Enzyme design. Sequence first.
Site, PDB file in Angstrom:
ATOM      1  N   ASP A 212      -9.435   3.847  -1.488  1.00 41.82           N
ATOM      2  CA  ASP A 212     -10.286   4.197  -0.351  1.00 41.82           C
ATOM      3  C   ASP A 212     -11.617   4.747  -0.848  1.00 41.82           C
ATOM      4  O   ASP A 212     -11.823   5.959  -0.947  1.00 41.82           O
ATOM      5  CB  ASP A 212      -9.561   5.185   0.550  1.00 41.82           C
ATOM      6  CG  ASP A 212      -8.316   4.586   1.159  1.00 41.82           C
ATOM      7  OD1 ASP A 212      -8.276   3.341   1.300  1.00 41.82           O
ATOM      8  OD2 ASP A 212      -7.382   5.346   1.472  1.00 41.82           O
TER       9      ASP A 212
ATOM     10  N   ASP B 262       0.842  -1.183   0.000  1.00 38.51           N
ATOM     11  CA  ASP B 262       0.000   0.000   0.000  1.00 38.51           C
ATOM     12  C   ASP B 262       0.885   1.243   0.000  1.00 38.51           C
ATOM     13  O   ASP B 262       2.098   1.165   0.208  1.00 38.51           O
ATOM     14  CB  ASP B 262      -0.946  -0.028   1.205  1.00 38.51           C
ATOM     15  CG  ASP B 262      -1.912   1.132   1.220  1.00 38.51           C
ATOM     16  OD1 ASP B 262      -2.421   1.502   0.140  1.00 38.51           O
ATOM     17  OD2 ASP B 262      -2.156   1.667   2.318  1.00 38.51           O
TER      18      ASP B 262
END
EC number: 3.2.1.207
Lengths: 87, 853
Positions: free
Chosen positions: B527, B451
């Site tokens: 997200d 990430d």
Amino acid sequence: YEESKPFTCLDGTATIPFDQVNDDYCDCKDGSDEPGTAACPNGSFHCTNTGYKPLYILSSRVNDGVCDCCDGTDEYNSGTVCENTCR
Amino acid sequence: VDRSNFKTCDESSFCKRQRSIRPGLSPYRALLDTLQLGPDALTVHLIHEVTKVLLVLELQGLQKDMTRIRIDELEPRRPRYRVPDVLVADPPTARLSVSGRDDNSVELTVAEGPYKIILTAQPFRLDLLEDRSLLLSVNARGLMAFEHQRAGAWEETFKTHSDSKPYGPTSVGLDFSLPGMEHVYGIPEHADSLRLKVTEGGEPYRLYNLDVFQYELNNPMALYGSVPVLLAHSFHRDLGIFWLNAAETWVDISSNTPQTDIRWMSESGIIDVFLMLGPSVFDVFRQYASLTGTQALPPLFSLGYHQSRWNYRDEADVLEVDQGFDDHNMPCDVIWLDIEHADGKRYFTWDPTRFPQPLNMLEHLASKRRKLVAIVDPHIKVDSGYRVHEELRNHGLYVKTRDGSDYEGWCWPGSASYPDFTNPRMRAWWSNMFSFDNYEGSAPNLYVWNDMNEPSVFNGPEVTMLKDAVHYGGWEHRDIHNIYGLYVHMATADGLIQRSGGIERPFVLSRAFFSGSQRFGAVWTGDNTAEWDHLKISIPMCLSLALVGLSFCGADVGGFFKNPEPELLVRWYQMGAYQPFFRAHAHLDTGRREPWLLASQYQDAIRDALFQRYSLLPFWYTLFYQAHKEGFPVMRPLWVQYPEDMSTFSIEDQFMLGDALLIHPVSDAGAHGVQVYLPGQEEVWYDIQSYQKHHGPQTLYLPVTLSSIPVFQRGGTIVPRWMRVRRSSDCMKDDPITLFVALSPQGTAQGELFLDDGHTFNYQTRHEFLLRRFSFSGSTLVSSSADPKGHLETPIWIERVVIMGAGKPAAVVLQTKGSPESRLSFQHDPETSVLILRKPGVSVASDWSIHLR
Ligand SMILES: N[C@H]1C[C@](O)(CO)[C@@H](O)[C@H](O)[C@H]1O
Ligand SMILES: [Ca+2]
Ligand SMILES: [Ca+2]
């Protein structure tokens, strides 16, 4: 000479020949023809668990490689050898 | 979202300069005296009419009906950047021939035709034709721009951040004209519609890997990944443009007998573009795959259901989640550990209180035949007690600033440094770090999540790294930005391979990505938010990734931010159940939403969605094998299967899996039904729940309930399923197959099935796999080998055949080599015309045929 009889599902429904009990194919809508295999989606497998309390598990957990019964009898042809741990 | 944190085109000085050049007479001219037709390429000088700058055009015809255009300075002060490691090979060229000439024109033939390239000298222009059909023009509107390297165009600031820009303006740009094209697609990642919009009244689409907090929908802001590939579709042809540039890039799209114009503008590097000439979209898939490679074959478990959140707090929590799935009869393959599992966000470590015995936790998960994923980010806490930071500092493997010191930004562990993943020495170090001796506490059932690899820098401009940071070889960060994440993904995947001795296939999820990222694992849309419109947009976002080669795509099930209402979570599970990467994930401050925490009616509908996904694993696996070998997307827009149905060119509330399944998930609260477009002349579709047959083309109104997932199987296809759903995919991978045969109106059907051990490279190094073809015609179903090289020891057998659209036979007969002819019992429902063949009992590795009398 005289022969032998067939099997009827515990939910009435249908009656199958006796060689289709535990033949690894689901023939009863209640799963009652496959108490010892993983063939029926709604069946159960009985852990005798002779050294502890008996237990029922889902048919989908028979020979899945995971030890579900303490006596290890749910895994008889999966490649996972389960030790008896009912103690 | 806070838009002021991210530059508009006007705030990007090179975008402002380039975009102010408007369509007109180009000052660029080809000097035909310099023309040289070489072994691989045609080279000809170009000249700016005013400035007298000399450029070199390198024009190549390529095998598989592609053309490559590269333009660089003739005598540059310093070398310009050419993107490495994205192309899997040096593309095989085709010979060019001068087959026509003028005083202002040269015509070239690729090999012996039918493809031709017309080079106009003044003004500079390129036309690509099949025979005499014009396919594409280059510089037709005169928007070519090449800022040569000279001795906000120089020192530049944005907000509080300063770009010293020691090389000044170096941007490059070029336009492309697509006659006959009105629909273009691709260039992810954007939270926008599948069909790209014209940019004339607003911003261009931006390609710059950026961490956009609480990003919003339907806008052209750059998100976490950048794939500079655009596809153009019409009734008549398909084309692709592949702009091989790793720097910040803006893309303008304009309409105009119908014609779409495309313009790319990049901050640095050379001009390097591939023209992929189709003519079908599957030709474009093949052409692009030959350039950048194919989707890595996922290990089977990674196609199951992943349960994740930020964060499971300790080992006991992980084991409780594991046991909850079994106690509530819900399948799950992987439990994920987010950043709170490490010691203060020092990656490759474990929190000494909450994860003191990681090997024991992994052993308990292995005993349930499940896996674990741990997050590993590319930022390294500046901490002299942290071995990773110390070794990377002592070996000089960090990204540096212009003064030679290691760059230091801010991220999750506070002050952090950033390894130079463009340096092959850093990637080899990173890969070795995943060995079981170096990554203490890891085990073969632990996989990795990369990430924040844009890279995300909390105190940097646009929340990323300074433009003038310095990488391996002296290149600036502005030169390499969009492949930084790719390199992290690559080095992590290689580490999981090498730690096993080269045997185990890797699984790595990555947030940032570039062209070629499909070779290293999965990506996801970052997200998102627990809202109905974010559920809807997961289809066009993953569809845009599928078209450009990234088939292993998904979105956070339930939404990352905020708390989804139970009905929304159910619909997201049903949506995610039919998307390639299937992971539930959630923000630190959300309520716990493991699926058994809901009321029974929502639990039951979620369990049903999970059961459907697991039963379809042989189908998903085969689609990914076809993606791995041919480069064909798993999840497809309807127009890929129906290129001549113009009413499908914009559809994005529906999609197909391969050519066999059409999906229209419910995506509105309280819905009473959906409108399902079933395409295809003389095509039939089967409602897989009711077995009701439907003829295309039509828009069907389908009533739905909470548990409904509108799915239809196409006539002429055969879909394999594991009807024995177990707790994980490892438990199921030796179970018998059920074949679902959807009869075409001609009474025919076909399908494939790939099988292997589920997790190693033995399919490729030892040819240990099975590729079966199932074909039905007349009244006979036949299993044959689709690849004779493949052999596999496996107990998998055919336990059932379900045939949709068939009449009641008089008898059913099975024949397979090595066995006597066998008779099968069967069941036939006259209302639905569904035929069930009981227990064929034949090995999946054996040739066999079933005949209906
Ligand atoms: N925002 C980042 C970081 C994160 O919040 C914790 O590492 C993770 O949960 C997200 O999925 C990821 O997108
Ligand atoms: Ca039976
Ligand atoms: Ca078991």
